[PDB]
């Protein structure tokens with residue numbers, strides 16, 4: 001079996017028959033986890049094991065940015081700082097900040113892989129304009145060059161544990177005012193203006209950027225469709241001008257802003273037609289199941305290659321071994337002293 005284009009979630013801390021049915025559907029390709037799916041490390045390891053037992057090719061992901069976005073915060077998961085804290089450290093000592101950024105990424109990925117998780121949807125590449133509250137301290141820095149090298153250092157730490165990465169929210173959620181969970185934000189800048197700054201980190205990262213989530217934002221001077229539903233943004237810009245060949249995950253189609261695509265199934269079709277390789281449908285598995293069964297057929301061979309490449313690489317240290325690893329301990333001690 002090969003991965004499908006739909007990333008969904010499960011009902012709870014243990015797998016149900018309904019979960020197993022959805023995980024076996026051909027159009028399923030991923031599971032995303034939230035706080036409600038975490039009781040403790042043992043329970044989570046058992047959950048991820050049972051998910052892969054149904055669909056061995058499944059991709060398991062989570063939102064672990066640090067600060068205000070980190071689903072697993074207890075039973076040994078290190079509470080990571082808001083990425084803004086690394087930009088503030090950069091402003092005091094550039095090189096130390098890049099050293100700390102890598103340690104953060106290694107801790108992040110190693111702890112996740114010890115519970116059988118493939119990837120985290122990080123780093124935020126939105127620029128810290130101060131205009132977006134929903135982004136806020138999730139942004140590294142104001143300067144696109146600083147965001148690039150800090151995000152790159154983080155992705156390096158992720159790579160040391162065999163974990164990929166996913167930059168977001170393309171082409172940039174940091175300038176718009178509204179929160180795309182609740183409304184549809186707008187960004188009235190010119191294409192060039194957006195390219196010179198907000199898009200630069202995506203371009204400069206090169207192969208250090210493994211995937212992208214596009215923003216549910218309408219860039220009115222470029223395309224009236226939100227970036228996740230926009231062939232201009234996903235193909236003309238990201239794949240064409242930037243030559244990006246990594247995976248593209250839609251942002252959560254359950255979000256209010258994504259209602260700019262119609263029903264869930266119609267929004268999924270539009271996102272995939274625009275250039276997304278996978279679509280996220282969070283917090284409503286039965287509605288996700290309707291999407292699974294109603295999704296209109298499409299060419300997917302190009303997408304499947306990129307989805308497979310998001311699986312974690314190599315072996316992972318289980319918790320009993322990770323806790324005694326000098327590198328892990330070194331990262332921990334550095335993160336405490338540096339911040």
Ligand SMILES: CCCC(=O)N[C@H]1CNC[C@H](O)[C@@H](O)[C@@H]1O
Pocket residue numbers: 063121134135168169173179180181251252280
């Ligand atoms: C409102 C700003 C965009 C935003 O914060 N999106 C988050 C939620 N959607 C999907 C995922 O849960 C997560 O990775 C995304 O980053």
